[PDB]
Each structure stands twice: as C-alpha cells, then as structure tokens.
C-alpha cells in the first residue's frame, strides 16, 4: 500500500490499547508526528506468534531471509496484534501460505512469487517432482485452540522514504497564528515568499489557489483557513542614500531611503 496526498495522524493508531507488540525503530515514537517524510509504504502480512521476534534489522532464520529481508537502514515501524478469533477457524485454516526453501539470499524490499518446487538440487529440479524435491511453499498450522506462541498475528510495516519531494504523507507544519500587515515568510504549498499580507478586495473563483498579475508574479494567494484573499507585496524596496554637504564645510550627513516608508521627514521620494 502506498500513501500519497493524504494527511496522517498517528495518535489514533496508538490509543487503540489492543496491540500485543509494537517495535518502531529509526525515529523516536513520541516525535514522529511532527517530523514528516515524502512517502509511506504499508506492507501487510500474517505471521505466527513465534516468528514476531525474527522481524528486526539484523536477524537470521527461515522467514525473514526468504520472504522479506530487513536492511540495516530500516526506518520502518512494525505493528502487530492478536486476531485469532477471525484469522483462524475450526477444522484447519490453511488458506495462508509461506515460503520455507530458497536457492540463495534475496534483496530487501523484494517479493518472491516463484512457485517452483524446491530441491537440494534446486537448479535441476524445476517444475518436476524428483529426489528430495519438495515444494518450497508449505501450509500453516493455524488453529483457534492453540496457546500464545503460534497465533495468527497481522504484521504491518510502515516504512518511510528519503528522497527529494515536498512532504505529502505528513503535514510538515500545522496552522500557526495568523499575522498580517508585516513582512513575514509563508509557505502556502506552492511557494516560499517573504512579504506582507494585506486584505484585498477582489474575490477568487472557487476553484483557484494562487493569483498572478500583468507582470506574471504571484502576488495573490488564498488562505486555506476560511477563504480570505490575501495580497503579496515585498517589504524591501530600493536602497539607501547619503547626503554630504562637502569637504571643508560640514561633517554631519543625512541618510535617505529610496522607496522605504517610515530629525525624520517623510519626503515624497522616501524617508
């Protein structure tokens, strides 16, 4: 499962108070809501109660090395719970399968669906039944009357991706206090512009987000809070200037600003 263009809250995923096990490495579990990434990959599969210890970076056995290998740089987050009342039934529930035999090791995050009957001589015995040639995929032994170490546990792996893209799965920042009439910096999902936010008098059509001008500059944005149209105007205009009476006449000077709005006299040509 791939998560995209959706905001995610992980507080509801933790306050269930029904999961038996939770291992979540790489990122501190208390501070993963504010920190966000690009994509979230959800991998779901069933496993027995005695194999939940094998799912960890740096383990060797018969399930992890043949079905889903965990790399060293595993920032995924593993959640599992007991579901014996639904994943198993009387008379023998053998609907779920697993691979026990494999020719060699496999790369992490790789799926193996080859239904090729394995042998000690794996490479000659292909699709045929030969000496010591037994199908690598075998049935389970799920039963609702078992104990605790062999119950059907539903394991979900919530991994994260590190590549350049704007964060989609998790909202990098939440709604902050609204400030206007001051030169501030904003990131309204499409630009990082530094400027003031005045109250405009022009209404936008109810399908647009941004707004340009004759000079083709994004000077109008719609705030997604309660749909008010705010203009964008840069706060830094022009430069400074110095008035000097000259040599052998004075020592003091006057400072002039070109297009900056404010002893001090507000002239037409600035401050």
């Amino acid at each position, epitope marked *: 499962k791939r998560i995209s263009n959706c905001v995610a809250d992980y*507080s509801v995923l*933790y*306050n269930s*108070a*029904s999961f*038996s*096990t*939770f*291992k979540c490495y790489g990122v*501190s*579990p*208390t501070k993963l809501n504010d920190l966000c990434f690009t994509n979230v990959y959800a991998d779901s599969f069933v496993i027995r109660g005695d194999e*939940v*210890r094998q799912i*960890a970076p740096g*383990q060797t056995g018969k399930i992890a090395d043949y079905n889903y290998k965990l790399p060293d740089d595993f920032t995924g987050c593993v959640i599992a719970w007991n579901s014996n009342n639904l994943d198993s039934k009387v008379g023998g529930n053998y609907n779920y399968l697993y691979r026990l035999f494999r020719k060699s090791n496999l790369k992490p995050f790789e799926r193996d669906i080859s239904t090729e009957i394995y042998q000690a001589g794996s490479t000659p015995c292909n699709g045929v039944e030969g000496f010591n040639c037994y199908f690598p995929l075998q049935s389970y032994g799920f039963q609702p009357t078992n104990g*605790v170490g062999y119950q059907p546990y539903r394991v979900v792996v919530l991994s994260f991706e590190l590549l350049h893209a704007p964060a989609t799965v998790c909202g990098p920042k939440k709604s902050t206090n609204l400030v206007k009439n001051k030169c501030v910096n904003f990131n309204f999902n499409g630009l990082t512009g530094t400027g003031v936010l005045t109250e405009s008098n022009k209404k936008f059509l109810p399908f647009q987000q941004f707004g340009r001008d004759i000079a083709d500059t994004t000077d109008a944005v719609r705030d997604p809070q309660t749909l008010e149209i705010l203009d964008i105007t840069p706060c830094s205009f022009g430069g400074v200037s110095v008035i000097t009476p000259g040599t052998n006449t004075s020592n003091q000077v006057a400072v002039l600003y070109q297009d900056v709005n404010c002893n001090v006299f507000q002239t037409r040509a600035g401050c």
Partner: antibody
Amino acid sequence: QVQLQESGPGLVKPSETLSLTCTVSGGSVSSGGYFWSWIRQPPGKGLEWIGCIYYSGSTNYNPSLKSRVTISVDTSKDQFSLKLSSVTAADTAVYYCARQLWLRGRFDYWGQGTLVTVSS
Amino acid sequence: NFMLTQPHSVSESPGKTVTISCTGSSGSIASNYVQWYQQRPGSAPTTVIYEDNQRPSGVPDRFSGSIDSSSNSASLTISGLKTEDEADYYCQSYDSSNVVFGGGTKLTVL
C-alpha cells in the same frame, strides 16, 4: 517546565478507603494527549504498577489490583486522584503519581513519593 | 503472566564494566519496549535509558542497553563505575495493557 505534587493523608487503616490526589502545575491535563498513571513501591521492594488513565474515561488496571482501583480525572482543578478499596497491611508502599506520555514508554517525570503506612 | 526476571545483587569494583540482565518469562523482549530506571534511595526514580538503544539527554554515554531476543534477556551494559551509580535498577515492559516492572538490581560494590 511542569511538576507534579501529591496530596492527601499519608495514613489509612486496614480495610479502609484510600484517597491520594496528585496535582499538576505548569501544564494542562487535557492538552497534549497525555496519559496519567500511579506507581507504588514498597520499602526494600521493586516498583509495582497500579493503573493508568487518560483524560477521558479510558483506564486499565493491574490484574493483581483489579476491581480495587478507582481513579478519576477532573479537568477543572487540573489534577487526578486515585481511590483504593479494601486496603490491608501489605499495601504499605511509597506512592508515586507518574507523569507519562507513551503507554509502552517511560515515566519521564516522577513526582515525589508520599509515604503510606497502614495503621492497624 | 509475563514477568521480568532481574538479578537481585550485582557487585563490581569501580572503573570496570558490568552487565545487568532483564529476562522475560512468557513474552519475548523484542515484542515491547523496555525502559530502565535508576533510583536513589529515598527519592523519586529517574529514567536512565529508553527505547533499548538510545540515551536520554542528561545521562552519560556509559549507560548502554542491548537486546538479545534469542535468550529473551534484556541487557544493560554499564561501564566505568563511580560513586553516584550506587542505586537500584528496574526494567519495565508493557505486556498487553498491563505495565510490568522488574525485580530490581542493587548496584552496591560492597
């Protein structure tokens, strides 16, 4: 930062109702999605978990202490209290109200331990 | 019925390295997070390490924890013993909606 202060008497008789209230100053009980729990520790023995609570009605108790722990949260006074029933002479322990965020995690801030000695 | 087995007495000279175990009976240690607590006599306990491999801000780098899920024993390796380490050590688990603590290790050299 934030701190937790316990109150209530340090005394209770056998088969009596215990009333220990832990108050919080410098923070909000309801805000932050923050859990609350109580931990007792007998002198010379290990820590024992009593129960944990949310700012809503969600709660859970130790099966050794099940059907005896009654903990309630009042947001207006910004504190939480625990009520213990059928207390005995073996319940003499140092009670700590425990500030904890992660239910599988840790008690990051500990309040000072009030001494409870059951008076026969 | 899940408990944490912890040695009662652990005594080594200052300056060396020690290992404190925390063994689970039924549930595997890799199933749930394990938190260690270092408590002075007559005061509130303080978390010395959490999340089984990383250290809280304030404690030295000597407090290291390791997980050995094969033997179901959680290890806390402490190196370079000194005067103010002489305290009780407790390990925590969660089981399933029921927080379970450890027996308790007294770190007294003599």
